[PDB]
Design a binder for this molecule. Sequence first.
Ligand SMILES: Cc1cn([C@H]2C[C@H](OP(=O)(O)O)[C@@H](COP(=O)(O)O)O2)c(=O)[nH]c1=O
Ligand SMILES: [Ca+2]
Length: 129
Amino acid sequence: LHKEPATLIKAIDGDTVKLMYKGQPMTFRLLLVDTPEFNEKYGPEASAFAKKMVENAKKIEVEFDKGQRTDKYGRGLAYIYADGKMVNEALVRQGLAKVAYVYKGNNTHEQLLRKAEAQAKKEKLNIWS
Ligand SMILES: Cc1cn([C@H]2C[C@H](OP(=O)(O)O)[C@@H](COP(=O)(O)O)O2)c(=O)[nH]c1=O
Ligand SMILES: [Ca+2]
């Protein structure tokens, strides 16, 4: 997999974000995770956490997996990095997202994220509390 440039346009919620990628605005949906919706328990915390992470970053990168790059809604599907740190993994590690939506052929970072989930669960963080 390869990291590619992008710039923040705006935070949306825990697991979606509006980025400019190859010069075009796009909503990205984070691979392999599911945050609560904003109106749900821990939804506001997931949104705040993802937002801070992307808004503070000097460098946003997009990393496509091996399979489809757009979902049926036209959302880009990628791993999103903020100054080298993966937003997908960080949400899971803090118990602000569950590993989810693991489809064959877009699952490169599955086990990295499950490891983070297991440690979040041990610490009974947030969703696991
Ligand atoms: C994360 C991801 C979601 N999706 C689709 C599955 C779900 O379809 P449905 O809308 O029919 O439930 C939806 C979940 O996204 P959200 O969690 O943002 O709602 O997006 C994919 O197709 N591929 C993916 O990799
Ligand atoms: Ca969601």
